[PDB]
Design an enzyme around this catalytic site. Structure first.
Site: not given
Ligand code: HEC
Ligand code: HEM
Ligand code: HEM
Ligand code: HEM
Ligand SMILES: Cc1c(-c2ccc(Cc3ccc(OC(F)(F)F)cc3)cc2)[nH]c2cc(Cl)ccc2c1=O
Ligand code: FES
Ligand code: FES
Lengths: 75, 147, 67, 241, 378, 60, 48, 54, 147
Positions: E200, E226
């Site tokens: 992150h 997706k």
């Protein structure tokens, strides 16, 4: 941590976009897609293929050699 | 305090009191025919008994210990000529060799391809040692006791 | 009487070109081993060579006879 | 010897992607097992209640189960007795332990047939070729006493005599009892025994194929609809001289 | 104003999934990391329903599994889903690692090393699972891996005995393997949280290898859809395996009950370890073989140290691409060799393949990088 | 409005509660329709093999 | 369990050898009786 | 400067067990929160070692 | 798709094919003397067969049915007055009623203090219904078959 608003500095760039209900989802899915796919395949085949061709040759030779070895010989 | 408690927890995983189970076993040698290998259970492991023919004895006595990784004469590992008692556990990683196979007519461990000769000595493979010879004794030329 | 389809199918299969050479070599091996005075020669490879080609063709047409 | 013989691929009726088992063949193979193969081999994980709804009705299955003596107990006095079978009882074992089995077959243990199809490379082909593969030994080759030649068995020497021959069994439905017919029937029954979920599996597979063929293009079209905004935009660089 | 951006608990999810800036040009290879998130949870679900019918007693383990297959309602579906999910997990895992290696994602050292830890943990969990059926291959795989620690000098026998809980593989081994197999996936998920946490901070990579702060888009709705499409394709492949070929990737020999005396003559592990089984068979030396096996897996930790190119990704590096595909072909060669008997000519081929594997990883890639640096004049 | 899709939008898909109601009703009918179709296809492909095809012979 | 609590090993062995317990199968598949060993549990007085 | 404060993993430990502002006068009745966690970890460890032989 | 998969997972936890197993049982009346309550195992649960005396029969006959929580006359729950057959499972939460206990000379469930009379009718406590009477028939003077 990283969030939109000050990730980087950009100047003098204009972007035009069209709504998803104003346009097709498959504009030229066969007329223009297939030439592009052929272009990409022609680009990548010479990089990707020869190692696997060599593996295929090694596989065939090894299998034939093992089978020939197992069978008995005269005398 | 920390050392004591950690030692107790570690020792709990070791072998329990009931799973020791050490005892002897008797094998009758009249049942085994000539030129055949037989297996028995002992401590949850095999126990190979081979009634070697005279041809094997003639063949395996015509080698020198220098070639062998583990020097040991054939006559030392057997208390009688036509009898071989061994523990059927490969010394590489513990697979059971298959009798009457390999390129030396002895045993062939196929997990990684280790060849032992008829006496039970490693000849070609990654096995460091030879097949173990547990303590055993006969009462006559008819039976044997292993312990 | 009762006659299995398997025997008839095998006899029809064995009159194909491919299996004739295998049976010929099997017979030659048999002749060499039997005429020999003493040897460890064993005509097992030729028998299986014959049987593989003989059983390739039987699988195609056997199950039509079987109900 | 080290030689091996790959069995050929026979065109079984259930060989297809969606083809299911023929239940009449399962019935005939069960009869073949009961009257021939049950003397030596064992089938431990199959009960009489499993035959109901495949090739027998409840009454027929109960009639088949009642023809067996099963030991149950203890009674009120603390003794074990015998009784007729029920639908909940597994097939009777032929021997009580492996040693008794080895004693009655010259040291060879007859394997359990509940997964023999799944436990061998070839499945039905291996068993069919084994049951119809015996022949005279090749010239200049010997073998022990109590063993028979079979080229499909590893080592080419097996301790099971030829079990099936002509007119060994009389089928209920008047089928001719040929060697190949009996072999085919018992092979079908063994296939059912190993994998009782064959037909339900293929039924579910058909629905899975249809639903996935429906669902793929719709989700793909949703993705294309969302990404059309990015895939068609344009950029212009207009520096201030 | 918006509760999503100020609630203590929803703020984490918003910053992790909904408003995350991501590159606009990441290809389908970036989906596999999400797929590994799905498969793990799937194995936690199906397996949790197998534990409600499994008993770890050595005398009633094979029978319990057959009871699950035959008596439990739809139990065969759950069993074969859990069985083939391992193969799907390992396919996704190797694709994830290859993606990271090709596009230079290893420069994130923390995430790369945590991933190496996750790889080892998942390998251990997969091996411990395969013993619980208690068939032939279960017994003779547990034996071999436990004896694998006997090569360590002066403590090997004691460690082997301690792991076995006795003088051999027996009931205690099966029970403790069941306990570890139950518990280890939770540790895997806990470590995967850290795998995400360290990523992150630095953001994600793209195929071009160039920093993509200029072109960013939100994660939602662009990479959620997706993710849905990739999950659908994964479910399609898994159900194809489950419903049209339940035993293609298995082994017949594990359908016989465990026999401590006999051993099959064609022992082999599962398809996703054969390459290691090809390496260990190559060296005729016990300690050397074990060290080679360990190093063949732990060489991924040294990949960041061998980087010598000015360009991050192999998209613009033809020689590196050729060497990468040679490495992939060599891994396929080792996987082919591991399923064959130890005999001529496969011994020579296996040894040459192992030598080529180590030489390609260690020697040739930095050399190609330096040559390409000299060709571009920098 | 003459077009079918315009009617569907103006009637059902405007609100989300009506969208959800339409979805659940469609699933309810589609379950039965798909089950009957799949069962019919599977029965036709394997005619004369399933138990229900040979059931009448044995039970009285 | 008695060894080293209230009897020596030899005493506890003799105690185990004072009773007969069932074992087998032998090579014929038959059960048989043998003297007790240290690992045997105390005999049950009734089968059930 | 201080890596205890800046490292992505250690900031949680610092902001939860080290630099957390706490009242100066919380009595012994505030100890049972941590004792419940000690108990939970004790039960997890002992239970896991009991599952190896159950 | 979601409905199908969740339904299959939920159905996996229900009773399996090997546990349904309905059956019947035979009991010997001559084995139960007057005044004794004999318990057996049937369908995995207790089954009580109690031989009642004339005093008990008359006492149950004197019960004012209109005051009962679950009104039933004694003569519609038994086939032969001297034999009462009941499933020995408390209707409250499943405990086992203890014979010859309670204030009414019937049964007493100690789990929560439910009192039953010699007919198995609920008379005091939290249990909502009278003990279940199974289907059964007498095949002769000495035997009873319960199913
Ligand atoms: C005793 C007279 C037997 C009867 C009747 C049948 N079988 Fe058998 N079988 C028997 C033995 C002693 C063995 C072991 C032989 C050995 O060498 O190990 C077998 C073995 C089999 C096998 C296993 C083959 C393998 O590769 O492992 C199969 C598949 C088999 N037998 C099939 C089979 C069938 C279908 C039978 C009924 C027609 C049958 N056998 C009967 C002994 C006996
Ligand atoms: C990443 C997670 C997991 C992986 C990769 C994994 C892998 C495996 C594998 C490969 C097998 C062998 C199956 C076979 O050969 O038939 C197996 C079996 C088993 N697993 Fe797991 N597993 C996981 C998690 C779990 C969990 C969390 C549980 C229980 C809580 C569990 C319970 C079982 C059981 C009971 C078996 C044996 C039953 C059977 O044979 O189907 N697994 N597992
Ligand atoms: C169970 C194990 C694992 C899980 C659940 C997992 C999951 C993820 C997820 C969700 C991402 C972010 C999405 C993505 O980038 O695709 C990611 C990224 C990444 N993972 Fe993994 N991963 C696992 C194992 C590994 C392993 C074994 C490695 C390397 C040896 C690894 C290295 C990486 C790297 C380098 C990235 C960042 C890729 C990039 O942005 O360039 N991970 N992982
Ligand atoms: C909050 C955590 C837990 C609590 C409060 C708890 C409580 C209990 C209790 C009260 C018993 C009954 C013990 C007895 O009467 O003999 C028990 C038994 C047991 N527990 Fe736990 N437990 C916990 C966690 C666990 C965990 C995490 C495991 C394994 C992973 C475990 C495994 C066992 C086992 C195997 C038994 C049976 C052995 C025995 O009866 O002592 N427990 N537990
Ligand atoms: C080398 C070898 C293996 C083998 C086993 C495991 C691996 C991978 C592995 C490595 C380590 C590991 O533990 C760890 F992650 F470190 F905790 C778990 C898995 C690779 C190979 N498995 C065999 C299984 C049979 Cl049945 C026989 C022989 C072999 C054989 O010779
Ligand atoms: S386990 Fe015996 S040779 Fe490796
Ligand atoms: S369980 Fe019987 S009174 Fe409550």
């Amino acid at each position: 941590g990283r969030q939109f608003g000050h990730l980087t500095r950009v100047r003098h760039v204009i972007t035009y976009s069209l709504s998803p209900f104003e346009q097709r989802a498959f504009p030229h899915y066969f007329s223009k897609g297939i030439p592009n796919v052929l272009r990409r395949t022609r680009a990548c085949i010479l990089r990707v293929a020869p190692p696997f061709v060599a593996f295929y040759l090694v596989y065939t030779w090894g299998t034939q050699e093992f089978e020939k070895s197992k069978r008995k010989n005269p005398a | 305090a920390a050392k004591n408690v950690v030692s107790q927890f570690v020792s709990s995983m070791s072998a329990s009191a009931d799973v020791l189970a050490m005892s002897k076993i008797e094998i009758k040698l009249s049942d085994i025919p000539e030129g055949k290998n037989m297996a028995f259970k002992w401590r949850g492991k095999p126990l190979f008994v081979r009634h070697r023919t005279k041809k094997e004895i003639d063949q395996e006595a015509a080698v020198e210990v220098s070639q062998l990784r583990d020097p040991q004469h054939d006559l030392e590992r057997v208390k009688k000529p036509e009898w071989v008692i061994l523990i059927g556990v490969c010394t590489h990683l513990g697979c059971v060799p298959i009798a009457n196979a390999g390129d030396f007519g002895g045993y062939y461990c196929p997990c990684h391809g280790s060849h032992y000769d008829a006496s039970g000595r490693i000849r070609k493979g990654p096995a460091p040692l030879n097949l173990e010879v547990p303590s055993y004794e006969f009462t006559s030329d008819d039976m044997v006791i292993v312990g | 009487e009762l006659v299995d389809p398997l025997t008839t199918v095998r006899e029809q299969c064995e009159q194909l070109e491919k299996c004739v050479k295998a049976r010929e070599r099997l017979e030659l091996c048999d002749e060499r081993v039997s005429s020999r005075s003493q040897t460890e020669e064993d005509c097992t490879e030729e028998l299986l060579d014959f049987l593989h080609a003989r059983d390739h063709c039987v699988a195609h047409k056997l199950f039509n006879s079987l109900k | 010897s080290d030689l091996e013989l790959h069995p050929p691929s026979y065109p079984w009726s259930h060989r297809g992607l969606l083809s299911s088992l023929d239940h009449t063949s399962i019935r005939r193979g069960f009869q073949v097992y009961k009257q021939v193969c049950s003397s030596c081999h064992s089938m431990d994980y199959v009960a009489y209640r499993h035959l109901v709804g495949v090739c027998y009705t409840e009454d027929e299955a109960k009639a088949l189960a009642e023809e067996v003596e099963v030991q149950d107990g203890p009674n009120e006095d603390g003794e074990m007795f015998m009784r007729p079978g029920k639908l909940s009882d597994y097939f009777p074992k032929p021997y009580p332990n492996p040693e008794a089995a080895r004693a009655a077959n010259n040291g060879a243990l007859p394997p359990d047939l509940s997964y023999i199809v799944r436990a061998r490379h070839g499945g039905e082909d291996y068993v069919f070729s084994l049951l119809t593969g015996y022949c005279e030994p090749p010239t200049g080759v010997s073998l022990r006493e109590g063993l028979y030649f079979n080229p499909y068995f590893p080592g080419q020497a097996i301790g099971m005599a030829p079990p099936i021959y002509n007119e060994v069994l009389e089928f209920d439905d008047g089928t001719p009892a040929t060697m190949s017919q009996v072999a085919k029937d018992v092979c079908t029954f063994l296939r059912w025994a190993a994998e009782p979920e064959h037909d339900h599996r293929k039924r579910m597979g058909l629905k899975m194929l249809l639903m996935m063929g429906l669902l793929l293009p719709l989700v793909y079209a949703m993705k294309r609809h969302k990404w059309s905004v990015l895939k068609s935009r344009k950029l212009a660089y207009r520096p201030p001289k | 104003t918006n509760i999503r951006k100020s609630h203590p608990l929803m703020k984490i999810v918003n910053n992790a999934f909904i408003d995350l800036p991501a590159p606009s040009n990441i290809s389908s290879w970036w989906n596999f990391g999400s797929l590994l998130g799905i498969c793990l949870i799937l194995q936690i679900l199906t397996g949790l329903f197998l534990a409600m019918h499994y008993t770890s007693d050595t005398t009633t383990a094979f029978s319990s599994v057959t009871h699950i297959c035959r008596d439990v309602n739809y139990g065969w579906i759950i069993r074969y889903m859990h069985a083939n999910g391992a193969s799907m997990f390992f396919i996704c895992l190797y694709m994830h690692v290859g993606r990271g290696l090709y596009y230079g994602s290893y420069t994130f050292l923390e995430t790369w090393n945590i991933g190496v830890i996750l790889l080892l943990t998942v390998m251990a969990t997969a091996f411990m699972g395969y013993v619980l059926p208690w068939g032939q291959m279960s017994f003779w795989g547990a034996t071999v891996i436990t004896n694998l620690l006997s090569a360590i000098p002066y403590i090997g026998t004691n460690l082997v005995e301690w792991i076995w809980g006795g003088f051999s593989v027996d009931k205690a081994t099966l029970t403790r393997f069941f306990a570890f197999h139950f518990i280890l996936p939770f540790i895997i998920m806990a470590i995967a949280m850290v795998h995400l946490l360290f990523l992150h901070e630095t953001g994600s990579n793209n195929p071009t290898g160039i920093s993509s702060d200029v072109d960013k888009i939100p994660f939602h709705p662009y990479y959620t859809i997706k993710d849905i499409l990739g999950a659908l394709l994964l479910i399609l492949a898994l159900m194809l395996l489950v419903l049209f070929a339940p035993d293609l990737l298995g082994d017949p020999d594990n359908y016989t009950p465990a026999n401590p005396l006999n051993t099959p003559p064609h022992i082999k592990p599962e398809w996703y370890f054969l390459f290691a089984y090809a390496i260990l068979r190559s060296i005729p030396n016990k300690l050397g073989g074990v060290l080679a096996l360990a190093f063949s897996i732990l060489i991924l930790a040294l990949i960041p140290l061998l980087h010598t190119s000015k360009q991050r990704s192999m998209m613009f590096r033809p020689l590196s691409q050729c060497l990468f595909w040679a490495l992939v072909a060599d891994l396929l060669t080792l996987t082919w060799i591991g399923g064959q008997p130890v005999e001529h000519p496969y011994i020579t081929i296996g040894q040459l393949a192992s030598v080529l594997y180590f030489l390609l990883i260690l020697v040739l890639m930095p050399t190609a990088g330096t040559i390409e640096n000299k060709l571009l004049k920098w | 409005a003459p077009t079918l899709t315009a009617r569907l939008y103006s009637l059902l898909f405007r609100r989300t509660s009506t969208f959800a109601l339409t979805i659940v009703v469609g699933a309810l009918f589609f379950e039965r329709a798909f089950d009957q179709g799949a069962d019919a296809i599977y029965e036709h492909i394997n005619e004369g093999k399933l138990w229900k095809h040979i059931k009448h012979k044995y039970e009285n």
